Design a protein around this ligand. Structure first.
Ligand code: ACP
Ligand code: ACP
Lengths: 336, 336
């Protein structure tokens, strides 16, 4: 677990989590077990959540959550890094404060006008309501990555994880680091989180797939990925195998596809074979479970462990996060 | 014979810089034909090279704006169409205003104070093309522009309002405001399934606007993905079109018409619980075909014509645009 051994790049959103009541949900007309794009009526909501003393600020975003969970799972200081776009405002300073507290060496790109991306995480029991305002998170430029103090994080990194969503924000950055990983013996990892499915983004994803050593995804993302490229099969075990056997780049030898199915087992394809991994629960046990699974998987991958340890750690971290308000965790882990 | 501003469009405007190119140009900038590539930044050496070419053509593009220009060209009545979208304060923004005025579209653009105007290089060789789109200011539209009286007057004047599904990612407030207004003031709100959604932020935003859609346009790929997202196991495009037309309707919305194109294969239309097939009829000795189909369909819909006339006009306009470099057309149409 060397300095900056694992790097992430994505859309950072400051998650403003707080336990709410019926009056709050009725006031802003927001329903539980739902995630909506933020509107004008939901913009003054971030001030009412701040006025609550029990508010929790977290440097969120799908990839950043995976990086924080990996840092928490590893515990070695300075092992993780992250790059993403934020705004020059109070929420941007809270993002920098929380990333430092989580142990992540974050080098953010500050946009000169777009305010920092935020996500209200309203909690009642186990249920949640997400209201994301992406705003600055979609303004990352490759000029930031190409600067020497930020490109040093790529050079230091052995494992680089980038979500498929980043292909819509900065396709130059993902392609540049994926090609660099193939040339300098680094492991490039990615996921099938491609919300937009246009010809522009399909061809952008087609160009980065050969450079992916690991492709993470969930049953819904994998089934849609299969239907897009004409694969008629619907069996998740067959789709995972077909993902692992996609064309490989010159600097690659094999690919591992990890498809989670929530409660159902985690499916892993490797060396032309598919293995099933039943989910093991914690003593007396969905928001951000996928992000926490990738985080736990990345931690054991960094330590040079076998696939079974990576799946068990992923499931452990996903089980911890779902029993907590948001993508939070205790001080130290209890995994083996 | 259509009234002033009877048809309005809202979207992501991009100045399409079209030009016929050769092998040396495609090799120089490493760009492939029949490929849609994103441009994180304007490649100035390429853009300036295109601007210095014989038969270089500037067009006020963008999927929705193309449909509006094709509808204006098909109608021929001056002042019948309107359009609102975000542009930058630069030379390409002035060329967008010049071409929209030439195309006969009353365009009221929102000028961003820093993001440069969205552009798209349309490198055409024979029948094939290569799109290199830099969205930039097109993704910066704010509902404050729509709510201004000189711009809201275009909504009030409009009987038919067409907005692409992709615009939900840019301004979901503007779509919800005009879709709910159309239901309250007996106006026809039309939309398409462009860039189908997989993330819950964008899926729930689309779920909120579907009841307000009187017409839903789409292609076989968009419709098949839309069906797989919401658990519809059927793959038959005729069954999918019927299921789209029978989605929940908003108060005071009696019916929905779903139009699913299949390229060469017939156009599928669902109406009053029945699906009708329309074979594509070609012109004597025969990208952007979908945009031109919607444009031709909108023109006859404005004139209060039957569905068969709308499909024939849509196919006529699509067949003209595909035998021209880009989404261009002759002075007057030949469809009666
Ligand atoms: N109901 C459940 N019970 C226990 N563990 C669960 C679970 N749902 C998910 N998990 C854990 O989370 C991991 C990832 O689950 P899943 O694939 O559903 O995530 P996701 O990111 O797609 C879901 P969401 O949309 O709820 O954020 C699983 O491999 C498992 O370890
Ligand atoms: N090969 C072909 N020959 C003739 N007409 C065609 C055609 N492909 C498309 N069209 C015309 O264009 C209309 C829309 O076609 P389609 O559904 O393929 O558009 P689209 O916008 O999805 C395609 P693209 O990705 O190429 O821009 C059809 O209804 C038909 O009138």
């Amino acid at each position: 677990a060397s300095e900056g051994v694992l790097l992430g790049m994505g859309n950072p959103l400051l998650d403003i989590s707080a336990v709410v009541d019926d009056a709050f949900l009725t006031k802003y007309d927001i329903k539980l077990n739902n995630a909506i794009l933020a509107e004008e009526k939901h913009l003054p909501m971030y001030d009412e959540l701040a006025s609550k003393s029990n508010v929790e600020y977290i440097a969120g975003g799908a990839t950043q959550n995976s990086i924080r969970v990996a840092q928490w799972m590893l515990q070695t200081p300075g092992a993780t890094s992250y790059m993403g776009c934020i705004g020059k405002d109070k929420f941007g300073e809270e993002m920098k404060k929380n990333a430092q507290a989580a142990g992540v060496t974050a080098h953010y790109y500050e946009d000169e006008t777009a305010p920092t991306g935020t996500c209200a995480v309203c909690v009642v029991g186990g249920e949640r309501s997400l209201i994301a305002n992406l705003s600055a998170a979609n303004c990352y430029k490759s000029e930031h990555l190409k600067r020497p103090e930020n490109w040093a994080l790529v050079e230091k990194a052995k494992y680089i994880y980038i979500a498929g969503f980043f292909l819509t924000v900065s396709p130059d950055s993902i392609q540049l680091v994926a090609e660099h990983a193939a040339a300098n013996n680094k492991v490039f990892l990615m996921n099938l989180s491609a919300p937009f499915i246009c010809e522009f983004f399909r061809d952008a994803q087609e160009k980065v797939l050969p450079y992916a050593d690991y492709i993470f995804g969930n049953e819904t993302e994998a089934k849609i990925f299969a239907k897009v490229r004409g694969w008629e099969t619907e069996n998740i075990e067959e789709i995972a195998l077909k993902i692992s056997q996609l064309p490989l780049a010159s600097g690659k030898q094999k690919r591992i596809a990890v498809i989670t199915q929530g409660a159902d087992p985690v499916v892993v394809a490797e060396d032309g074979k598919v293995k099933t991994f039943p989910v093991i629960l914690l003593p007396k046990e969905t928001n951000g479970a996928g992000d926490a699974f990738v985080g736990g998987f990345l931690s054991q991958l960094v330590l040079g462990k076998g696939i079974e340890d990576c799946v068990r750690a992923g499931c452990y971290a996903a089980n911890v996060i779902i029993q907590r308000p948001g993508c939070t965790y205790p001080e130290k882990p209890d995994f083996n």
